[PDB]
Symmetry: C2
Subunit: 100 residues, 2 copies
């Protein structure tokens, strides 16, 4: 679930990690600091750090920012896994955050 | 960078580009081992490793990156390194020429 704090990657304020794969611009959201730091541990030298979006306002500002970055999807809890990746459309997340 | 280049390919022209630091970046590997190890840890991205042996295959690769506004590529990227190796696409481009 996406309720609860979202953990994302951020360099200088506002510069979030955007990756181009699957024919789109993707960012990432992790559902726990451990999962995000784990991913961070496997991707150094990108000037990134884990950032926590604890409030509705911060989660909201984050989505707006993904929009400014023209990102229409985010991978949820991405990691070297066995299950098909979880890709959420930003348009869908903008609806979800209204539950928070 | 004299030898064969190992790169990632997905949809045509689609390479793995990441926005970090101040610009757009991709990745190039000198070892098939490092490239395949990186790919193994990055599943679900529809990527595959392909080898660029020709000077003409390296050029076609860099020009696609150039048009995708990718100004630099990470050389032999992998976790547990002190610092990363970065090469301007413009440099590699002129070099290959
Ligand atoms: Cl860093």
């Amino acid at each position: 679930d996406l309720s609860g704090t979202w953990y994302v990657l951020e360099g200088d304020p506002g510069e979030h990690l955007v990756v181009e794969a699957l024919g789109e611009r993707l960012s990432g959201i992790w559902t726990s600091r451990e999962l995000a730091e784990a991913f961070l541990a496997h991707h150094p030298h990108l000037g990134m750090r884990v950032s926590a979006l604890e409030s509705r306002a911060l989660k909201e500002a984050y989505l707006r920012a993904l929009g400014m970055l023209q990102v229409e999807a985010v991978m949820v809890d991405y990691r070297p896994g066995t299950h098909r990746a979880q890709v959420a459309r930003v348009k869908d997340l903008l609806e979800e955050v209204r539950r928070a």
